[PDB]
């Protein structure tokens, strides 16, 4: 199949051959295959599904990043990413608490631009922790 490398300035998050991945993108979530469309893009706050040989998924949080899928060695670069069991479902539910408090505690436009990103980080965590249960 194809080889995926996922890195951040803090760590290498994954690297190896993979059969399929479903990945966050700029306009919406995107499905990848061997010889998929040779495309580079920015990504929204979200996650990636890593379905390996014998069909085994794992779930990686992608809080921010840029990707490349043109070569047979594909690549996600993450401005922040967290491994799917270092985060927890309880931690993301706390993330919901902060986002909803700052929505109540934001009142202008500039602070709403940060509170909207603080919400997006919580919502993307709240997404991967449910997916993590599969």
């Amino acid at each position: 199949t194809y080889h995926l490398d996922v890195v951040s300035a803090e760590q290498q998050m994954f690297s190896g051959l993979v059969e399929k991945i479903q990945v966050t993108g700029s306009e919406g979530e995107l499905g990848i295959y061997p010889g998929h469309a040779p495309l580079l893009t920015a990504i929204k706050p979200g996650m990636i599904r890593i379905v390996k040989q014998h069909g085994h998924e794992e779930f990686i949080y992608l809080s921010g990043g840029i990707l490349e899928v043109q070569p047979g060695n594909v690549t996600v670069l993450a401005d922040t990413a967290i491994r799917g069991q270092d985060l927890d479902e309880a931690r993301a539910m706390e993330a919901k608490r902060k986002a909803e408090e700052h929505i109540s505690s934001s009142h202008g436009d500039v602070d709403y631009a940060q509170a909207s990103a603080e919400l997006a980080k919580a919502i993307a965590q709240l997404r991967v922790i449910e997916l993590t249960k599969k």
Binding site: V7, A9, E10, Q11, Q12, S15, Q70, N73, T75, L77
Partner: protein, 57 residues
């Protein structure tokens, strides 16, 4: 000067040996701790040099 002074000189060289030995170990602790930062930064940078290996084509 005399033996009294020479004996005092030797004590300052003995003091210097210790301190230049302590900061040899303390340095070797930092050079291993900073090697972890380098080894963690390396994979991200290695990917960036692969990414421009595409962008050149």
């Amino acid at each position: 000067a005399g033996a009294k002074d020479i004996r005092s000189k030797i004590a300052s060289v003995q003091n210097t040996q210790k301190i230049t030995k302590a900061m040899e170990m303390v340095a070797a602790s930092k050079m291993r701790k900073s090697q972890d930062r380098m080894a963690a930064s390396r994979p991200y940078a290695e990917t960036m040099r692969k990414v421009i290996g595409h962008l050149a084509h």
